[PDB]
Amino acid sequence: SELDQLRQEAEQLKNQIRDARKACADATLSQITNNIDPVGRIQMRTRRTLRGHLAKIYAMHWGTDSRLLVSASQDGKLIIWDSYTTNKVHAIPLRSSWVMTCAYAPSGNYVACGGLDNICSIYNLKTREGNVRVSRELAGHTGYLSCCRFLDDNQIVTSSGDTTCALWDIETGQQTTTFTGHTGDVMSLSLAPDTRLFVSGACDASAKLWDVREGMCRQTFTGHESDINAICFFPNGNAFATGSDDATCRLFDLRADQELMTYSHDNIICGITSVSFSKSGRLLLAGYDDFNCNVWDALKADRAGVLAGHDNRVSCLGVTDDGMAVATGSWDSFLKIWN
Amino acid sequence: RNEEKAQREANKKIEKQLQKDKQVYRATHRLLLLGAGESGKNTIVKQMTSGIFETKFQVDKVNFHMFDVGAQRDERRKWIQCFNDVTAIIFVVASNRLQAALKLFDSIWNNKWLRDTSVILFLNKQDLLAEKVLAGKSKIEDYFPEFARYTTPEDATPEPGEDPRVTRAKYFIRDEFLRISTASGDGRHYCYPHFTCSVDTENIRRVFNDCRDIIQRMHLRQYELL
């Protein structure tokens, strides 16, 4: 039948894709970086601990100027901290306390949040009255909001649990582009430095690269064994790293269109919640469900250090634009700056 | 340094708001309504788009916050981890839909993030079950072969006017959930069975009394008494 012929035809395309991928695999990353010097034993200590959040933390985002950062907690509050002096700048109440993501605009004039309410709310921080009030409520998603990233002051890219990604234009409230193709719930998304493309991780153990302007999926990356919970583009924008529930992290190359190196350990059984890169991309920081954060040498896959300061699972982490410090969010209602 | 002084004053003002907001958060007992499909969970809220629904009610001057998930797909393995600190999870079961409800209770019971969260079990549609058993059109033996050798436990307190046939059937379904409950969760969480209807006004009282047991056990655990 026609349905059976398409499935039979689809296997030929997948086999051809595997044939093309195998031919390009002439030498893995292990032998290329085998002769390089080891990164050595690296150390970080908790410089500051941001306290004041009532409930567990789910998302955080560093500012462009690398001093003001926002944190989203499940108690229904958005707090903008001053990491240099630990003082709190803004405390934005939320209509829905079930938010799961937050973002900071590159200009710093707006912040966004979203979660189980399926609505992305943008708050104006530069109001003439001083108080922070909402500016635009984006509706149209049929699933829980998992991630959101800003392109500019009038554009934002959001991911939802309905296996679709959308691009929104502020001041109108209508989505301009919709990204479809995923079969599982989208958990995280990361924007390339060039902003022309972005990648997203879903629950189908696959990562898809999308063209923001065109709205079409360029490449699909497979290899993971479970749901992908985090993603982060390489600083050069030509690669990204993914964290999954299979206790393994993998690095995918856009040009190679295949996995380059996998980070795994026998003692690690728990999954990975958040993934971020350093300024140079040599180090890879990934959170774990065992209340610890592990730094991975991306070039050699050897463990470089362990961050053990959180009493609960690490749900979010990030590195500032200048790479001066890394802040990790955990379910223990405390945010710690590591440096 | 005047700006720094203003920053400290602004931070101090925020702390007062946080202190007042802290009292409200601990004054409300959050609950998750996780009734299965065609289980009558909508009728419970009604008798006391949008991806979530909120319903606030007060019982004996105790604030309660009940949350029903709508407009969210059938993949519950991702958004259920958010409800890992609620006071209790209200599980409504329509008494092979029953088999599906038992495999959703077992995976809630065994979840890593939900092993400390207690679950309130509501055996709904008791009136519907009473007439089905008497009619005899549907047989529980075909769907559950263990019903043949099952006997009514001695702790049962049947209501007046209840035939032994329906009493054995309703307790057999309840005991199936208890088998999963008494198989894991070594003192971290407990399951409370309840035979409830869709029109009874005692459901809010049952939840209030159930939350009393949960908080009492939690306080004893902190003191290493239980």
Epitope: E225, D245 | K103, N111
Partner: nanobody, 128 residues
Framework: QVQLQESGGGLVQPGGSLRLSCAAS????????MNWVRQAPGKGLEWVSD????????SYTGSVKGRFTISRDNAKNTLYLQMNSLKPEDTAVYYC?????????????????????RGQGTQVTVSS
């Protein structure tokens, strides 16, 4: 790529026997719990049976408690389901479902309408 290819099934006379195999590839079959699901026409998915990682824990549904047998081969990365004493009511498309996460006692979204970790099952028809 998580791929699960099913085999077996077909037209069988009432009271016959059938054997379904579930080929596993792209993942470590030894540390994942496997489930059996079926979808007869005109109704949604239903759970059939499951097997633990080492096979110590075995459970079936009420209808096939005393008729079906579940077995797995960790070395060969295959899953078997021995069907005996068939009845015409058992006609359905059987899929082998993989647990969402490894080393996890719970297994969520097994019978969801859309499941990424589910293969294309084989139609089973029991009629005279």
């Amino acid at each position: 790529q998580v791929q699960l290819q099913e085999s077996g099934g077909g037209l069988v006379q009432p009271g016959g026997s059938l054997r379904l195999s579930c080929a596993a590839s792209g993942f470590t079959f030894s540390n994942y719990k496997m489930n059996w699901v079926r979808q007869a026409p005109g109704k949604g998915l239903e759970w059939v049976s499951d097997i633990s990682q080492s096979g110590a824990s075995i459970s079936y549904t009420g209808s096939v408690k005393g008729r079906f047998t579940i077995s797995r081969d960790n070395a060969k990365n295959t899953l078997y389901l021995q069907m005996n004493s068939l009845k015409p009511e058992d006609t359905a498309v059987y899929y082998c479902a993989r647990c969402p996460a490894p080393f996890t006692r719970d297994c969520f979204d097994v019978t969801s309408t859309t499941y990424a970790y589910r293969g294309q099952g084989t139609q089973v028809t029991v009629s005279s």
